Amino acid sequence: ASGGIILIIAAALAMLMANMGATSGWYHDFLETPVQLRVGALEINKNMLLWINDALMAVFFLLIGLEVKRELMQGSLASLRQAAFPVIAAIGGMIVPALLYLAFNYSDPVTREGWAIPAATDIAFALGVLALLGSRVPLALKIFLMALAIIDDLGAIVIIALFYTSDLSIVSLGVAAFAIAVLALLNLCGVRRTGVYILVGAVLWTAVLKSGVHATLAGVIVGFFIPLKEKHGRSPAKRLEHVLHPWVAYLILPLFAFANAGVSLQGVTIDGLTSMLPLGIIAGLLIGKPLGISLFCWLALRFKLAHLPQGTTYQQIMAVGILCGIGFTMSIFIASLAFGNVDPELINWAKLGILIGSLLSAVVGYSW
Amino acid sequence: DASGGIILIIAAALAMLMANMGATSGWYHDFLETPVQLRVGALEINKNMLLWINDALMAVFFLLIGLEVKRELMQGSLASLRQAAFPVIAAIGGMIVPALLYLAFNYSDPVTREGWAIPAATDIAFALGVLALLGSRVPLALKIFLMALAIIDDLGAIVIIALFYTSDLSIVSLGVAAFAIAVLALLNLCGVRRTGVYILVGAVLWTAVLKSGVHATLAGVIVGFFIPLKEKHGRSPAKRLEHVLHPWVAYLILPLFAFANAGVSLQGVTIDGLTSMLPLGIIAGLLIGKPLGISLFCWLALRFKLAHLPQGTTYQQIMAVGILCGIGFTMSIFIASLAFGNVDPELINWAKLGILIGSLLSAVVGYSWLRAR
């Protein structure tokens, strides 16, 4: 559970940096620093936070691409029947948190763009809370929760990168398509040097630099093509996932939390927190997650299209539904995509709703 | 095992093809001179494309060197404890004679006098690549004497350019550079064995000195110096990293640096141009300065009992390494690109011609004569 504590400390310092007279200012101005890259005629203008997030979420989603692949062929999602329960819980864990959010935000066209914010679940945080009491919690839950949180996060990133994301340039797609093809020919020819895939993946990542959500999905694509075969008792993907895990839990996620979870608290009142944007997120996380998860799981069980993990009791299914209300880093990233190039206070009110919702979901889910 | 030297030759041929057929001469030249501006707040870095590539490639190449040096200096053939001082005395000859021979031509020209360290370089990979071409039963110490000898010349050349012939770094750069070593020194004392943590900190050292190619190059050897070489549990971080790092240098870093820096348009190149003081000085300093300098210092050192002799020497085999040390190639091209920055652009082009003709003459003479003995 070590990864979860170091993440909260990182968020604690950020709130501290953002709310002290001496630090707040240098903290805000650093993150808002403009970074202009100019390559001949090409020109990429992103502030500092954008450049950092695009790199951090790249490697983070590279690890998820490996974990999706290992669970899709060797774990929970391997068969179509075992994957019935995590998938059903995920759709409910997405539509109900979004419906609640939309119920509050439908009348404002500017805020109803962030409907996917309370659909994300911080895997590292939620696993930390489970591992905090994980002396003898059922093994199936920790893999169920992992598979559950991943499909929503990836699906959200997918649907954000299909519709709501802006189109790329013609040249950028040609290189992206060619880079993916080289990753395919590398896999079909059976090369097992992990660094070569990372090399081709770097070209992929660079071509779509202007789109932060595409540079993110570039990580998932690379993680899919790292070979998983076990020749001579060695696997490139299993080895790479083993290398990335401590770096993601102890550096990538803490840095992402430190650079994004700091909002000023000055002037924040209960009436402000009950406006449509933060409360829609709070209600989406604190209520929408355990509602949609329990409802669909209960609907699954009764209507024969179901399964059940070993040692489940079905009260522990709705329990982790509450723990899935911890959006945290993943919801913050979604909010940064939904609320870029709009009014700067939209992202600030969003983080406040996420932090309150996630903190309530963590404490409430800890009582069970 | 000679595959690295051959791939390094194909890449230079391709580069020469790119820079001479009209269909590609435009793209190759324009791409390498493409300007690249990074503006971080008020900070700003302007370097053409080729400089960014070389500062990144030569940082990785010299990280591998720092690993090899520390091994060969703390538990290797060169070693500390002043035992194998035979290459150290030979290296001073591999730098003094090529420099004095070069300066004999270019003394009257204050501009070209700056490139006196160009023939002092030696392309390690290609020189051993031409030795591995014959390396069925060549003395092991010979190759690891060549490899130990070539580094002192290349390291010393980079050091002198970094200590005198380089431009200034701001105090903010120097400060972070010094703090980046303090955390490296804290890591080394505390016994941290994660290779990545040393590379993370190294990345900070590299970017802090990014305004200077030599310092960016010096940052590679320093990271390779501070990585623990200890053999705890039969696993060494330096040896593990070098075994991963070595194939990428021979197959990707060096052929890329060659493909990017060994392409020179040959239109109008006459025989009068190659006999100019600048290229001929590089030709002579390599084709003659290396063999005459290396052999004369081993001769001067052996007779006066200050020296040593590797097992299976014959001393005529040394003179084959000498003519083989006239292989400047990539290493001299890098030195040339540093000594001839922010001056007339044709200087680097004429320097490159003197390097390839001098190395080719050294490779052929070095091969055809060592194949006789």
From Swiss-Prot, chain A:
SS bond list: none
Gene Ontology terms: biological process: regulation of pH
InterPro entries the UniProt entry points to: Na/H_antiporter_dom_sf, NhaA
Main location per the UniProt record: membrane
GO CC entries: plasma membrane
Protein localization: Cell inner membrane
Membrane topology of this protein: Multi-pass membrane protein
Keyword Signal in record: no
Annotated coiled-coil segments of the chain: none
Record keywords: Antiport, Cell inner membrane, Cell membrane, Ion transport, Membrane, Sodium, Sodium transport, Transmembrane, Transmembrane helix, Transport
Transmembrane segments: 3-23, 48-68, 84-104, 114-134, 143-163, 168-188, 208-228, 243-263, 281-301, 317-337, 349-368
Reaction(s) catalysed (UniProt annotation): Na(+)(in) + 2 H(+)(out) = Na(+)(out) + 2 H(+)(in)
Keyword Protein transport: no
MF-aspect GO terms: sodium:proton antiporter activity
Top-level lineage group: Bacteria
Function: Na(+)/H(+) antiporter that extrudes sodium in exchange for external protons.
Annotated family: Belongs to the NhaA Na(+)/H(+) (TC 2.A.33) antiporter family.
Protein name: Na(+)/H(+) antiporter NhaA
Native organism: Salmonella typhimurium (strain LT2 / SGSC1412 / ATCC 700720)
